[PDB]
Every structure is written in structure tokens, then in C-alpha cells.
Design a protein around this ligand. Structure first.
Ligand SMILES: Cc1cn([C@H]2C[C@H](OP(=O)(O)O)[C@@H](COP(=O)(O)O)O2)c(=O)[nH]c1=O
Ligand SMILES: [Ca+2]
Length: 129
């Protein structure tokens, strides 16, 4: 896969952000992860982690996988990087997201994220506490 530039409009919650994609404001949904909803346990924490990671970055980038680039809701589906660090992976590593929604042909970073999830589980972090 390859990274490409992204233009952040605003973070929304733990696993969605709003981006300007070819001049269209568009929600992007992070691939391979599920954060809690904002008013569920660890919701506000997952939101804040994603928000600070993308807002405080010098650069956001996105990376499409090989399959669907949009979901049934018109959301873009990507891996998002903040100054080269993958937000999807960081959330899982800190126990703020589960690996989830793994579909064949959009699963390039599956094993990387499962390695992070196992470490968060071993450390009993957040969701796994
Ligand atoms: C992450 C992801 C979610 N989705 C869909 C599955 C769920 O659809 P259904 O709503 O029909 O169950 C929904 C979960 O999104 P959220 O976790 O953002 O609520 O988005 C995809 O189709 N592909 C994906 O890669
Ligand atoms: Ca969610």
C-alpha cells in the first residue's frame, strides 16, 4: 500500500475523522478497529486520544487498502497516520479499540493490529482491564 496526503477538517470520535477528500468533506472510518461510542466506557478516552493524535500532528496521511474504499454509509475506509504513526495501531495498542470489522481484501494490517491487541490484553489496558 502507499500513503498519500490527507486534509483533516476535524476529529469526530475514536474511530472516525472528517477529511477534505478531493474537495469534498467526507467522514473517514478507520479500518480494522472499533472504538467505544463516545458515551460508553473508554469512549471519551478513545475520542480524546484520536483527536489529539491527529490535531497535534504536523501532517496527516491516509492509506487505502486493496478492497472497498467506501462503506455502505459513504464513509471512506482507510488507515490514518499522524506524523508517520498509524492511529489505528496506536488505539489498539493502548487498549482503546478492539481489532474488528476484518474483511478479506481490506485486511493488510491485520496481523500488526492483532500483535498490538495481544500486548494491550497482556497489560490489561482499558477495554481489557
Ligand atoms: C470498519 C468498517 C465498518 N463497516 C460498517 C459495518 C457496520 O455496518 P452495520 O451498521 O450495518 O452493522 C458499521 C460499523 O460502523 P461503526 O462502528 O462506525 O458504528 O460500518 C464497513 O462496512 N466496513 C468497514 O471496514
Ligand atoms: Ca465504533
Amino acid at each position: 500500500l502507499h500513503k498519500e496526503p490527507a486534509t483533516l477538517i476535524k476529529a469526530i470520535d475514536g474511530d472516525t475523522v472528517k477529511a477534505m477528500y478531493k474537495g469534498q468533506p467526507m467522514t473517514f472510518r478507520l479500518l480494522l478497529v472499533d472504538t467505544p461510542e463516545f458515551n460508553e466506557k473508554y469512549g471519551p478516552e478513545a475520542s480524546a486520544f484520536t483527536k489529539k493524535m491527529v490535531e497535534n500532528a504536523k501532517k496527516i496521511e491516509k492509506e487505502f487498502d486493496k478492497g472497498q474504499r467506501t462503506d455502505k454509509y459513504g464513509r471512506g475506509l482507510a488507515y490514518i497516520y499522524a506524523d508517520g504513526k498509524m492511529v489505528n495501531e496506536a488505539l489498539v495498542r493502548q487498549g482503546l479499540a478492539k481489532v474488528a470489522y476484518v474483511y478479506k481484501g481490506n485486511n493488510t494490517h491485520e496481523q500488526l493490529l492483532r500483535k498490538a491487541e495481544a500486548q494491550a490484553k497482556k497489560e490489561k489496558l482499558n477495554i481489557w482491564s
